[PDB]
Amino acid sequence: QECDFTPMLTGTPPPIYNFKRLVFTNCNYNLTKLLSLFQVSEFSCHQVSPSSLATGCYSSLTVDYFAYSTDMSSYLQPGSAGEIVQFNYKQDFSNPTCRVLATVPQNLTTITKPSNYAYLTECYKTSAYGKNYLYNAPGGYTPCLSLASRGFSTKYQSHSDGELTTTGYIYPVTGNLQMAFIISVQYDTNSVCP
Amino acid sequence: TTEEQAKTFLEKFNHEAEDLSYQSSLASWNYNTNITDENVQKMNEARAKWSAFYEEQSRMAKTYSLEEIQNLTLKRQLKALQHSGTSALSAEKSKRLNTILNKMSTIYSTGKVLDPNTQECLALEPGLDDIMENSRDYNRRLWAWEGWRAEVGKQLRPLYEEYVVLENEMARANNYEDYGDYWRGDYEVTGAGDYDYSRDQLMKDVERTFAEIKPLYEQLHAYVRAKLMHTYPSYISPTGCLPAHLLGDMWGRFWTNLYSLTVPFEHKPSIDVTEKMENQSWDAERIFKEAEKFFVSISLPYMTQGFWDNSMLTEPGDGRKVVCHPTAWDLGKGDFRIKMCTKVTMDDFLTAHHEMGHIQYDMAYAAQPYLLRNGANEGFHEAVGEIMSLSAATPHYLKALGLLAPDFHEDNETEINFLLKQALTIVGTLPFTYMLEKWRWMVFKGEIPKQQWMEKWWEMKREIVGVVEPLPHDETYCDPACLFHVAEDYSFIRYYTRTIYQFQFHEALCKTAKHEGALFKCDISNSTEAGQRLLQMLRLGKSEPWTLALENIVGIKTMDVKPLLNYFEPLFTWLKEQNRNSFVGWSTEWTP
Ligand SMILES: *[C@@H]1O[C@H](CO[C@@H]2O[C@@H](C)[C@@H](O)[C@@H](O)[C@@H]2O)[C@@H](O[C@@H]2O[C@H](CO)[C@@H](O[C@@H]3O[C@H](CO)[C@@H](O)[C@H](O)[C@@H]3O)[C@H](O)[C@H]2NC(C)=O)[C@H](O)[C@H]1NC(C)=O
Ligand SMILES: *[C@@H]1O[C@H](CO[C@@H]2O[C@@H](C)[C@@H](O)[C@@H](O)[C@@H]2O)[C@@H](O[C@@H]2O[C@H](CO)[C@@H](O[C@@H]3O[C@H](CO)[C@@H](O)[C@H](O)[C@@H]3O)[C@H](O)[C@H]2NC(C)=O)[C@H](O)[C@H]1NC(C)=O
Ligand SMILES: *[C@@H]1O[C@H](CO)[C@@H](O[C@@H]2O[C@H](CO)[C@@H](O)[C@H](O)[C@H]2NC(C)=O)[C@H](O)[C@H]1NC(C)=O
Ligand SMILES: *[C@@H]1O[C@H](CO)[C@@H](O)[C@H](O)[C@H]1NC(C)=O
Ligand SMILES: *[C@@H]1O[C@H](CO)[C@@H](O)[C@H](O)[C@H]1NC(C)=O
Ligand SMILES: *[C@@H]1O[C@H](CO)[C@@H](O)[C@H](O)[C@H]1NC(C)=O
Numbered sequence: 105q106e107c108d109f110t111p112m113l114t115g116t117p118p119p120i121y122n123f124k125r126l127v128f129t130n131c132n133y134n135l136t137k138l139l140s141l142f143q144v145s146e147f148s149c150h151q152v153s154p155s156s157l158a159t160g161c162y163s164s165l166t167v168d169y170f171a172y173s174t175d176m177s178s179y180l181q182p183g184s185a186g187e188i189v190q191f192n193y194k195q196d197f198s199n200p201t202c203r204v205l206a207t208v209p210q211n212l213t214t215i216t217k218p219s220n221y222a223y224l225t226e227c228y229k230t231s232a233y234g235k236n237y238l239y240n241a242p243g244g245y246t247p248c249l250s251l252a253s254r255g256f257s258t259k260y261q262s263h264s265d266g267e268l269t270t271t272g273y274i275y276p277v278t279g280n281l282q283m284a285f286i287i288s289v290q291y292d293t294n295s296v297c298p
Numbered sequence: 299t300t301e302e303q304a305k306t307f308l309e310k311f312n313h314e315a316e317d318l319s320y321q322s323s324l325a326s327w328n329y330n331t332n333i334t335d336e337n338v339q340k341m342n343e344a345r346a347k348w349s350a351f352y353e354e355q356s357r358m359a360k361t362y363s364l365e366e367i368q369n370l371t372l373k374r375q376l377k378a379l380q381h382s383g384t385s386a387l388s389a390e391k392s393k394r395l396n397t398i399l400n401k402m403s404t405i406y407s408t409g410k411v412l413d414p415n416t417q418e419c420l421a422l423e424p425g426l427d428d429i430m431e432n433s434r435d436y437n438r439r440l441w442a443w444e445g446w447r448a449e450v451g452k453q454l455r456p457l458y459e460e461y462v463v464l465e466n467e468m469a470r471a472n473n474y475e476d477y478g479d480y481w482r483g484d485y486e487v488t489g490a491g492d493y494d495y496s497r498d499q500l501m502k503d504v505e506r507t508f509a510e511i512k513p514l515y516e517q518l519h520a521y522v523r524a525k526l527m528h529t530y531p532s533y534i535s536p537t538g539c540l541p542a543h544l545l546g547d548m549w550g551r552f553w554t555n556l557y558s559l560t561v562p563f564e565h566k567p568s569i570d571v572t573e574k575m576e577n578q579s580w581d582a583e584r585i586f587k588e589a590e591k592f593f594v595s596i597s598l599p600y601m602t603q604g605f606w607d608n609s610m611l612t613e614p615g616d617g618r619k620v621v622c623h624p625t626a627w628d629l630g631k632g633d634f635r636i637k638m639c640t641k642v643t644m645d646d647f648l649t650a651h652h653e654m655g656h657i658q659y660d661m662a663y664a665a666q667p668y669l670l671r672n673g674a675n676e677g678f679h680e681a682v683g684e685i686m687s688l689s690a691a692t693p694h695y696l697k698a699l700g701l702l703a704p705d706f707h708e709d710n711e712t713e714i715n716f717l718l719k720q721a722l723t724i725v726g727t728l729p730f731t732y733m734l735e736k737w738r739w740m741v742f743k744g745e746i747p748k749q750q751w752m753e754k755w756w757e758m759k760r761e762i763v764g765v766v767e768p769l770p771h772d773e774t775y776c777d778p779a780c781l782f783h784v785a786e787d788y789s790f791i792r793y794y795t796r797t798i799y800q801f802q803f804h805e806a807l808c809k810t811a812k813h814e815g816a817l818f819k820c821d822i823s824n825s826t827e828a829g830q831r832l833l834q835m836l837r838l839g840k841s842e843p844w845t846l847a848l849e850n851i852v853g854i855k856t857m858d859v860k861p862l863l864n865y866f867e868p869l870f871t872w873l874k875e876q877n878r879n880s881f882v883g884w885s886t887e888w889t890p
């Protein structure tokens with residue numbers, strides 16, 4: 105039962121607030137083959153080790169991936185706050201996890217490049233008493249996702265439906281595309297083994 | 299009832315104001331960092347759109363009655379929206395007031411004095427300012443001081459007379475006693491119980507704190523007079539007031555530029571890390587990274603990525619014209635920027651800390667509704683900015699950053715030099731600010747008839763500030779109008795209370811940081827408790843009365859000047875020892 109990572113290697117990686125999630129079960133994961141296709145720049149694990157991640161059996165293997173510039177790596181750290189964690193992605197630390205920031209080599213052509221990197225700067229309900237900010241749950245999506253699906257063509261651009269407001273930020277992609285992967289393991293117990 | 303309709307109205311206003319305010323701010327930023335005619339046109343269009351929206355919304359808001367509203371947040375928003383201002387005047391009167399204001403601003407900006415010797419016309423900036431800041435020639439300084447007041451103030455006298463009448467009419471149209479009462483309305487708190495604060499209480503508190511400030515200022519005044527008698531023998535009475543044109547600038551607002559004539563220990567050099575910064579190859583980005591690290595160390599948030607990629611931290615060299623005044627911009631919707639032409643110097647280091655403190659204050663209250671996004675009153679923002687610069691200059695903070703040697707020795711002569719230099723800027727400007735605002739309050743109130751405007755101006759100068767005019771001036775002069783804030787219609791008491799707030803905040807945080815020793819050596823770095831205590835007040839914005847925010851940060855709800863006297867106590871002891879063979883005080887009878 106070889107594991108298929110093909111859909112991740114095909115298409116355009118999404119923005120962070122619309123991250124892609126792949127769940128694997130009853131698999132045989134060749135993790136080294138997957139990671140050898142990218143120029144890895146950062147690999148930080150919690151409750152596990154990079155060598156221990158590539159060994160042992162798990163009941164389920166989840167990968168959340170998106171396009172993300174490595175120069176923003178400081179905003180994607182455990183205990184860090186700010187707009188990225190609040191409105192785009194919150195890493196769930198209830199299980200062993202590993203965050204990998206990598207660069208796409210010019211070899212890979214199935215991975216097409218987006219026009220811009222994008223993220224949300226705020227997501228709130230409006231009222232007469234101020235802004236009621238809506239925060240991401242650990243490992244969950246933003247409640248402003250439907251509004252953000254419209255798209256952003258300028259910096260600090262707002263979309264509102266009347267009871268919800270979201271603001272987006274974009275900046276162009278230069279050079280090789282950079283990506284972020286979040287790997288989580290949940291653990292019958294030998295479905296996913298090396 | 300009325301409250302529900304007001305709530306609906308305010309929800310609509312809050313929803314609609316965000317985009318218009320953001321576009322106006324963005325146009326203003328694009329003009330300020332890139333000076334072109336098209337940018338001016340875009341900025342004007344954005345400002346016009348925002349003004350039209352705000353006028354329509356104020357007109358709609360005036361229909362709701364404040365007495366019916368129970369919730370205080372809604373009441374504060376509605377009271378902010380219901381203020382008419384100059385719109386309470388008739389169209390002809392409002393047009394006349396605008397014409398007078400523009401004329402006074404133009405007269406101040408384009409005034410010139412002709413030097414007889416060189417046949418050269420000097421403007422205030424940079425021409426006359428260079429004389430008052432650097433000259434030690436009695437006659438040259440007198441020529442500049444008298445020429446500026448004879449050439450510019452005599453033009454402003456009749457315009458200012460008309461301006462006073464028009465502004466009093468405007469103030470009485472908005473249900474105020476006069477224009478000074480209207481200005482003091484900034485500090486007024488109503489319907490809050492023990493936190494209430496009236497407009498007369500402000501004058502009472504200012505007088506009470508100034509009476510406590512007076513002895514330290516008298517010791518400083520005597521020290522400065524004794525020092526200046528060496529530079530100007532036969533021009534200075536040992537028991538009299540100081541001549542007004544020998545104080546280091548055009549008005550005597552600050553005594554800073556007198557430092558080289560009054561330094562207690564000339565042989566001891568001050569602490570300057572600029573050479574160390576050049577030796578280690580610093581740049582502006584590293585300076586701002588250090589400021590960010592300082593704020594992170596007290597458990598404040600990081601800067602945003604947009605802050606790093608959208609600010610103007612250095613002067614551009616691509617052919618763009620900019621303004622190099624350091625400013626912190628809160629455009630809205632999560633957009634925070636800083637405009638600064640940073641050099642590699644200690645002063646730019648301190649300024650970076652100060653402006654990032656402004657940014658932190660802007661970020662703390664971002665969730666408040668639009669009309670409540672500001673400091674608790676007009677003095678809070680600058681005091682918050684000042685405490686960061688206080689912490690950043692200490693030898694402890696500089697030694698931690700490697701800008702000083704680990705075996706650096708701190709002698710008390712260097713400390714007394716530092717304290718004297720601080721006092722020349724901070725203590726010396728308080729009587730000036732107090733006297734100016736008191737005179738303006740009495741002119742607006744009518745306690746000074748126009749036949750005595752100048753007469754009361756110099757009588758107060760001699761008795762509150764200890765400063766005497768070198769030449770007598772009749773009622774054809776208007777000396778107060780020769781100052782920028784008076785000619786541009788700006789209230790001045792913010793510079794007083796801010797000072798009082800500053801040393802109240804600092805002393806409160808240093809005790810939270812468990813500092814041991816003198817207050818002027820305190821550095822609050824690596825103290826998360828002090829950062830949390832500061833954030834408690836910062837998150838409030840303007841949604842609470844300022845007395846409640848003050849009690850949140852310092853534990854009492856009143857202005858107190860004892861922390862300021864605690865900051866300067868070693869200098870006070872040294873001064874009282876130095877003036878032991880001198881006269882302390884002044885007479886109001888001697889004249890140059
Ligand atoms: C604020 O605090 C930081 C961190 O302080 C560190 O953690 C605290 C909880 C305490 O246990 C501190 O003792 C501890 O240092 C200070 O930065 C730290 O400064 C010290 C100075 O003693 C540095 O130690 C040096 O480290 C280098 C290696 O880089 C050695 O060559 C030296 O021999 C010496 O051990 C330490 O590295 C440094 N830590 C970091 C992360 O930079 C900081 O100075 C302080 N700020 C102020 C204004 O006091
Ligand atoms: C800087 O500090 C020195 C040293 O003072 C010592 O260290 C300080 C940090 C404090 O802890 C002091 O308590 C401590 O003594 C000062 O010099 C000292 O000044 C005092 C006056 O305050 C001198 O006392 C005098 O001594 C003579 C006898 O020689 C008597 O005639 C006097 O009546 C009086 O008691 C003391 O001698 C002197 N010390 C030395 C070593 O000269 C210094 O004034 C101070 N400078 C500033 C600008 O603050
Ligand atoms: C500074 O302003 C000038 C003119 O105000 C800008 O030049 C314009 O750039 C836009 C790009 O969107 C061109 O389409 C216009 O034709 C240009 N106008 C002119 C008159 O040349 C310039 O880009 C601005 N500089 C920066 C750094 O934003
Ligand atoms: C995993 O993939 C790598 C490719 O780099 C390969 O060398 C290795 O044998 C694979 N692991 C297996 C087949 O267990
Ligand atoms: C693919 O990347 C590898 C890894 O370095 C490199 O050797 C190879 O040249 C690349 N492919 C091409 C066509 O250059
Ligand atoms: C106003 O209403 C808000 C929300 O309904 C509430 O939090 C606040 O305490 C109220 N204030 C007053 C003074 O009634």
Ligand SMILES: [Zn+2]
Binds near residue numbers: 652680
């Ligand atoms: Zn400032």
